[PDB]
Design a protein around this nucleic acid. Structure first.
Lengths: 100, 71, 93, 92
RNA sequence: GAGCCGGUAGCGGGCGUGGAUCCCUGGAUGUCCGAAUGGGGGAACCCGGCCGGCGGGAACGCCGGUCACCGCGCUUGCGCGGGGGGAACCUGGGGAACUGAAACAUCUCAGUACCCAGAGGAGAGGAAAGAGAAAUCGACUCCCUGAGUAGCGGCGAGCGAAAGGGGACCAGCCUAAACCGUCCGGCUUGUCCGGGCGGGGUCGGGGGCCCUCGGCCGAAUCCCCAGCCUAGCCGAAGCUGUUGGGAAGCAGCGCCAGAGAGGGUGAAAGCCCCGUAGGCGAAAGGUGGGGGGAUAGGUGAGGGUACCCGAGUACCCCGUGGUUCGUGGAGCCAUGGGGGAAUCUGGGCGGACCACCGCCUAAGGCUAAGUACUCCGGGUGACCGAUAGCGCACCAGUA
RNA sequence: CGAAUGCCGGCAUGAGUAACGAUAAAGAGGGUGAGAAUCCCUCUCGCCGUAAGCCCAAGGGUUCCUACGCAAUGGUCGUCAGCGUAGGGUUAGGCGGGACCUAAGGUGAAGCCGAAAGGCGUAGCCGAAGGGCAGCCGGUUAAUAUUCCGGCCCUUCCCGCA
RNA sequence: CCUCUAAGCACAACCUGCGGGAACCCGUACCGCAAACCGACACAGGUGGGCGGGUGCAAGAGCACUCAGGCGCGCGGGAGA
């Protein structure tokens, strides 16, 4: 709803910036931010556990957002923008020379 | 929830004003009991409240539609 | 105020003071030496009248008085009474 | 109705002391009357109400950053229960 | 069509392809104040009557319904209506001053500002008792002309038309009165008076009534559709390499184009995203002669009678207003006061007034469209870019 | 843009200056705390006492009590506060007002007047610190009390009885 | 509040006992001659009502001291023109 875009929880290839060429699963989508997730962008956040119950929370720290225009879905073949087919009854998305 | 709602209506929709009234009276009570132990902390799971206020909205909405051609 | 018959109501007019020989005589002509607002009122009067049982008065401009003695003649051909001094006048059109 | 007039219970050291006598006290919807309350309670706890004292509470006014507001105002009623009777529900 | 549980962060908990959140339509619920309308009142609060319900309820309190006033109608009660609001815009009722006149009074500003009442998507006006000199034209409104002309004017300052022509729009209708019927309520109970319905009748010469001749157009009204607004949908074509945190730069080699508007993507991208060109779409509620239908409605000649063609009206005088017209030679339009006709040999007008000649048929009403305005939705900009642009980019009509 | 005693803003100078708001007046010993002339406690000293004491109206509207705080506010200081944060606290048939009364005055059926807006006005309605009217003394809280509690005492409705 | 009579009604109705029931809404903290009210301020200004003890001076709400109670007035320390 004005929010909507390209992909959902699935395998997508990044073409981004730093993580250019990357192939990652489920993008865990926003779309408030038009952002996604993959295993692309990663950083360290500093911590001491929300409650020092199990002391430190840890230190590896997880994935940044990443603009949804950076990713590009994929199937039998590569990237491909999505196209949208009638189906004769409902409506699904098929990739250019492909399906789903 | 969604399917639960769907069914909650199905029954509600075939009760009679008299009975809706009585049932409401009960949900109204449960709700009090909630907001009591809501208000002491000692046991309370948030969603359970909005859930029952709407339950009740639903019933009373239904009771209105009944009351036009029936009583 | 206003004539209940005619609808006549005070109108606004000017009061113009002049001086001078009218051009149409000795000449030079006249000179307005002051204009000012003022009103002209209709010549309103009071007409008490019997009709049916009850007494009924009009507020009416003198020009139109007869017009009432027309109605009273048009009023004869009617069903009326029933303690209604004012309710007559209304029905008297 | 009835479970709409009684809202919650007080909860204060003052309000507790109260329970020694049959004096339990409740936040109650502020338009309700002494009578409304008496009957509302009679039906809520099947006890016998013998006296009602009511009082309003100007809601405190409080802040959060530059946003200045009020809390909602309330009314509380402190209700007497017949001798021997008690409301088990309120005895925490 | 995959994420949600507002402006999200957190505790604490839940929901969703068993198709959620979200968007549009309709419906339900909608405390109290406010036209505020049971009564009162210092707005958002107090206090009542009647009907019916809850509690042990008779006192007491809760719930539901209902009870202002005014105007029109029809059998005293019941129906319709009204009321208040609205950014401008409109009409009407009232109506200034600074100012200008290089002082100032006539004059100007200006019937402006403002106050009041009213109207609505518009309002006003509108089918000639018109214009005005043409064997003339033919409702009204709006634009351009006509023209700063004609004129008005302490002939100062200044004010300032109309016919005509070019355009937009296009539309004409219903009554009153003679006469005929009918109901009613009075009386002086009559071949009658006047009140109500219906018929008839609507015009520059017509209508009624008596005597000879009998046939299509058609709504502004109602109905159905088309279309249109309130959510949406589909939509061509790019990879690699290179610097760089980051390519969309630079390079190699491609492709689409009814799409090379524009924004975004780590920098500068037709071919990544949102779009654009081009083309789809409404169950629901709005809108809707634009295209159909259907009503209401409209459809003659002669020859006679002279029965009717809107009254305190015309007309004249007094006092004023409007018009370009300031008492002028001062008509026309309107009317506070006085006097006061006629029904076509009737009557108004063509700038005092007479006489010819001609124009028009007053004293009842309705009428779209072409015109104005921008609260609101959208599109554009040799418009602003945070001392600018609205007072307000920000929780401002706030502190 | 350099001048308009210009407009908004920022930053100087006077300047470590005048002032710190009643000449009722202070001192010491202990606590507390990073820090104390300024907070707590004690003891000495002074001032008010038809008050500068106590209680009520109006006005103010949480300033009340308690626990944390000390950036700012406090004319210094601050560990304190009427300041910040949080949580608590106001209990009535008899107190006061309302389901009673009328005063000036307001409103206002009828009625009158006015270009519109509106102005008057009889009854009535509104209108109080005035009339009418049933509660005293104690005890409780950190913070309310004629309101809670105890003792004694009253008033009005409705119903039944004699 | 007493009393008088009107329609009415006297199987009502008042009056006096006595018993049992019923008894809403609003205010109630705190300041209150003041640092909490009006004075832009914790401003030497203004603010209606009541209580306001004791001893002495002829009296008194005056004047001096003082009870209860409350305060030393939210910058100090020195000097000694």
């Amino acid at each position: 709803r004005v929010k909507m875009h390209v992909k959902k929880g699935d395998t997508v290839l990044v073409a981004s910036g730093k993580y250019k060429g990357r192939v990652g699963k489920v993008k865990e989508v926003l779309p408030k931010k038009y952002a996604v997730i993959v295993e692309g962008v990663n950083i360290v956040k500093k911590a001491v556990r929300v409650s020092p119950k199990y002391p430190q929370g840890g230190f590896i720290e997880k994935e940044a957002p990443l603009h949804a225009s950076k990713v590009r879905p994929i199937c039998p073949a590569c990237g491909k923008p999505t196209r949208v087919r009638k189906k004769f009854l409902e409506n699904g998305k098929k990739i250019r020379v492909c399906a789903k | 929830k969604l399917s639960e709602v769907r069914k909650q209506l199905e029954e509600a929709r075939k009760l009679s004003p008299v009975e809706l009234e009585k049932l409401v009276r009960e949900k109204k009570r449960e709700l009090m009991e909630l907001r009591f132990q809501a208000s002491i902390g000692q046991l309370s799971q948030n969603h359970k409240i909005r859930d029952l206020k709407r339950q009740i909205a639903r019933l009373l909405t239904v009771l209105n539609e009944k009351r036009r051609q029936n009583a | 105020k206003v004539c209940e018959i005619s609808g006549k109501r005070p109108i606004v007019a000017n009061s113009i003071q002049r001086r001078g020989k009218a051009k149409r005589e000795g000449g030079v002509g006249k000179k307005t030496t002051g204009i000012s607002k003022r009103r002209q009122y209709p010549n309103l009067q009071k007409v008490r009248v019997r009709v049916a049982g009850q007494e009924i008065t009009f507020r009416v401009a003198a020009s139109h008085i007869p017009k009432v003695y027309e109605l009273v003649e048009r009023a004869k051909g009617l069903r009326l009474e029933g303690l209604s001094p004012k309710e007559i006048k209304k029905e008297l059109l | 109705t009835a479970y709409d007039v009684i809202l919650a219970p007080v909860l204060s050291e003052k309000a507790y002391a109260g329970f020694a006598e049959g004096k339990y006290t409740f936040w109650v919807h502020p338009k309700a009357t002494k009578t409304e309350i008496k009957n509302a309670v009679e039906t809520a706890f099947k006890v016998k109400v013998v006296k009602v004292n009511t009082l309003h509470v100007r809601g405190k006014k409080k802040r959060l950053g530059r946003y200045l507001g009020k809390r909602p105002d309330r009314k509380k009623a402190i209700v007497q229960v017949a001798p021997g009777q008690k409301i088990e529900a309120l005895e925490g």
